[PDB]
Amino acid sequence: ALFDYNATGDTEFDSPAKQGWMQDNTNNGSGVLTNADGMPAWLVQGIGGRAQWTYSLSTNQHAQASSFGWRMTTEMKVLSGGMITNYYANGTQRVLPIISLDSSGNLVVEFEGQTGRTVLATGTAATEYHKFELVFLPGSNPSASFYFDGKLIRDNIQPTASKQNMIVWGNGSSNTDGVAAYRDIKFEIQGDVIFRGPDRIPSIVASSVTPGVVTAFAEKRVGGGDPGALSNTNDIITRTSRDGGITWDTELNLTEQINVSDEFDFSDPRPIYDPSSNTVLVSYARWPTDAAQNGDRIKPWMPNGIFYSVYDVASGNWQAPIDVTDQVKERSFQIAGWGGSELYRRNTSLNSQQDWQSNAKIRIVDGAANQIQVADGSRKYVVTLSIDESGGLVANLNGVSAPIILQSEHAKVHSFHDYELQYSALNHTTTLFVDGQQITTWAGEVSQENNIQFGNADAQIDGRLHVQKIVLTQQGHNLVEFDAFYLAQQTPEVEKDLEKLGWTKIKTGNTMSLYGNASVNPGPGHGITLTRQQNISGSQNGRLIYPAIVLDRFFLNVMSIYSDDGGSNWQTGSTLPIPFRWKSSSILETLEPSEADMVELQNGDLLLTARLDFNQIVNGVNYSPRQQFLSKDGGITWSLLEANNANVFSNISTGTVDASITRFEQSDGSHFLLFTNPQGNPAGTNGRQNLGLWFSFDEGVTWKGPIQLVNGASAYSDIYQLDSENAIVIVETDNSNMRILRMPITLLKQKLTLSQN
Ligand SMILES: [Ca+2]
Ligand SMILES: [Ca+2]
């Protein structure tokens, strides 16, 4: 909440007594509107009496002040004298900087109960107007810092005693003369609640093109609780604030339109701000009101999906939501030949002296020895697909010795591709066609196998493959035809068990195979738009991107869902590489990266923070409750940042929670990242208390100590640069209520950059 005064120029209303303040003078002590050379302001005249303006707050207001903090900002001109007292006080302590001119005319500072005197300016600057800032950070061991003109003067100001309770400005001594023109005075009590519990899961972003427009989101949870409860209906909500986050328009439910009968639950509003059209693009997930992610009760045949809504910042209108599940929710039969070998065979009766046609739509997620095999009694044709240590798709054909680069662009390296095999009886050979691309021709080994076969061969070679369709035709008739895409999405009634459908499952060691994708969830915070992709291979500038959560069936992981199209068309990248281990038969041990956030780094690389959801230790190697991953290709594939997990943040909370990360861009040119997360009430604990904020000046290699932002409940949070000096912050606190913080990153940064001895 704000409390200020300012020189409007007009008569009647430029009086602090108009702008809500109180008069508190003693004889001769006067005030008056001055406008020196067009400089409108309130002149305080503490000649032979005190002239000072007060303002009185409520108990709850001071509590809020103690919980989330405050900041005081004064733009004034000290004309003469001393005991210029601009400060705040609550019934038990105050912070009192005394602004005055020394016998030598220089403007100087001194703090109550604090040894030392500091010259602010000298010469004729000493009577110039200046910016004066008092900044208070809540803590068990609190403090405040004082800034003069964006520089930091004193820090660690220990609060002293009083029983005075109010905000005050002017000359506070009756016996000490002081004269000053105040062009502006601002008092801000931090966290105004914008969204109330049990609504949860906020995110936020700001316009850079229309300075001041901020857009916040959360989940309207009617009944409270995570999506999937028969006892709730969750929707998405927003609030915009055209003034930096001071006031906010009415709460808008973007979803009720979409969910007529409240048959669905929506979740995870992940918006992205797009500078070219100057729009917010929010993406969020839908689930049926009775099943979702939790307990993995969500099935590929329920209404899980992803939808977006576009907000026109220029005219403040919203466009009805658009569904894009199709483009981003894969439907396929999936085979994970990790620590196992899994194969599906269909015995066929192909007349090998006559022609035949083979078609399979396959996608290689990772590894090798995933393969397709046609055998017509006499001979065998085998295409072994595998991914390079360079991240390229390669093909080993049978009998052949030389592998064939199949794809270089990482994006194509992990996308679907129609592999065709054309058999010519005539000259007794076949040819390979990857999406119209005639590759090679060859005559595989001789056998007595009359087969159509696919899967992962070696039990000692890990690979994973996803099938969508398989067909085999001879002389104008389809012998075999399997469409995973179609069945995946079918209700249990529709028979999809390969075995029962005709195939022979052949598997050694442990594997896992499933139909389609159970659900996609965009994620908690905000998304970005990439701008440093020019020297990155195959990525582009203007890419809209965000790390979504995929639930295959049982295990959760994260992938990118992006748009090089500006947003009309969407893509999907590979999943995070996780270390796996079978503790026993049918007992798998891996991580499950969930709530995730990314920042585009200076060189173009992508930096991701992900929360580790069910089990964080694999092979005795502990993974904190959080891990970082890096992508050097625009978010197509990632690589784990070994030993870049929770521990990277001193004093972070050992609990598992959602955090946030962003880029902060200084007008002067410099930049860095801002990172939010709770700390726990005592030294790095498992508790959602005292949200902190780390920075990183070296591009996420390291981070610098958590500066505390809150004293109390701190949960999910999201941060985004408001303007050149500010970062607005949105968190969950008491009873999950979501509060707003307007941080001055430019000033706070300084509490970390100085070296003293
Ligand atoms: Ca529900
Ligand atoms: Ca987040």
User: DSSP secondary structure string, 272-340?
Assistant: EEETTTTEEEEEEEEEETT--TGGG---TTS--EEEEEEEETTTTEE---EE-HHHHS---EEEE-TTE
Distance, CA of 460 to CA of 453 (rounded, Å): 19
Cβ-based neighbour number of residue 623 at 10 Å: 19
Distance, CA of 648 to CA of 657 (rounded, Å): 15
In this structure, which amino acid lies at residue 192? D
In this structure, which amino acid lies at residue 677? N
The domain tally of the chain equals: 3
| 587 and 674 part of one domain | yes
Q: Point out the domain boundary residue: 189, 211, 229.
A: 189
| 621 and 754 part of one domain | yes
Q: Point out the domain boundary residue: 483, 516, 549.
A: 516
| 569 and 717 part of one domain | yes
Distance, CA of 597 to CA of 107 (rounded, Å): 47
Cβ-based neighbour number of residue 596 at 10 Å: 28
| Residues 396 and 443: beta-carbon distance below 8 Å | no
By three-state DSSP, how is residue 61 classified?
Answer: helix
Asked if the structure places residue 62 within a domain, the reply is no
| 289 and 335 part of one domain | no
50 is in an annotated binding site: no
Residues with a catalytic annotation lie at 226, 595, 716
Asked if the structure places residue 335 within a domain, the reply is yes
- Closest ligand to residue 288's CA: 1
Distance, CA of 728 to CA of 726 (rounded, Å): 6
Domain, as residue range, for 575: 190-329+517-757
Could you write out the DSSP letters of every residue in 229-257?
A: -TT-EEEEEEEEETTSSSS----EESSTT
| 530 and 511 part of one domain | no
Report which secondary-structure segment, H or E, holds 629.
Answer: strand 626-631
| 1 and 86 part of one domain | yes
CA 255 / ligand 2 centre spacing (Å): 21
742 is in an annotated binding site: no
CA 196 / ligand 2 centre spacing (Å): 19
CA 449 / ligand 1 centre spacing (Å): 53
- Closest ligand to residue 286's CA: 1
CA 548 / ligand 2 centre spacing (Å): 11
| 441 and 303 part of one domain | no
| 127 and 206 part of one domain | no
Paired tokens of 48: 């032979």
CA 289 / ligand 1 centre spacing (Å): 3
- Closest ligand to residue 660's CA: 2
What 8-state DSSP symbol labels residue 415?
S
Return left, alpha or beta for 248; rule: phi > 0 is left, psi -120 to 50 is alpha, else beta.
beta
CA 327 / ligand 1 centre spacing (Å): 25
Burial 469-499, CB ≥16 within 10 A → b, else e: bbbbbbeeeebbebebbebbbeeeeeebebe
Residues 472, 477, 483, CA angle at the centre, nearest 5°? Answer: 45
Asked if the structure places residue 63 within a domain, the reply is no
Q: Which residues contact 161 (CB under 8 A, 6 or more apart)?
A: 92, 93, 94
Q: Point out the domain boundary residue: 162, 189, 216.
A: 189
CA 263 / ligand 1 centre spacing (Å): 8
Q: Which residues contact 141 (CB under 8 A, 6 or more apart)?
A: none
Residues 502, 506, 509, CA angle at the centre, nearest 5°? Answer: 150
464 is in an annotated binding site: no
CATH number of the CATH domain containing 723: 2.120.10.10
Paired tokens of 31: 């005030």
Query: What approach was used to elucidate this structure?
Result: X-ray
| 280 and 419 part of one domain | no
Burial 570-595, CB ≥16 within 10 A → b, else e: bbbbbbbebebeeeeeeebebbbbbb
| 597 and 744 part of one domain | yes
Q: Which is nearest to 528 in space by CA: 414, 673, 315, 702?
A: 673
Burial of 222 (0-12, 13-18, 19+ CB in 10 A): middle
By three-state DSSP, how is residue 743 classified?
Answer: strand
Paired tokens of 52: 């000072």
Q: Which residues contact 462 (CB under 8 A, 6 or more apart)?
A: 337, 338, 339, 366, 367, 368, 456
| 609 and 755 part of one domain | yes
| 575 and 634 part of one domain | yes
- Closest ligand to residue 225's CA: 1
Asked if the structure places residue 65 within a domain, the reply is no
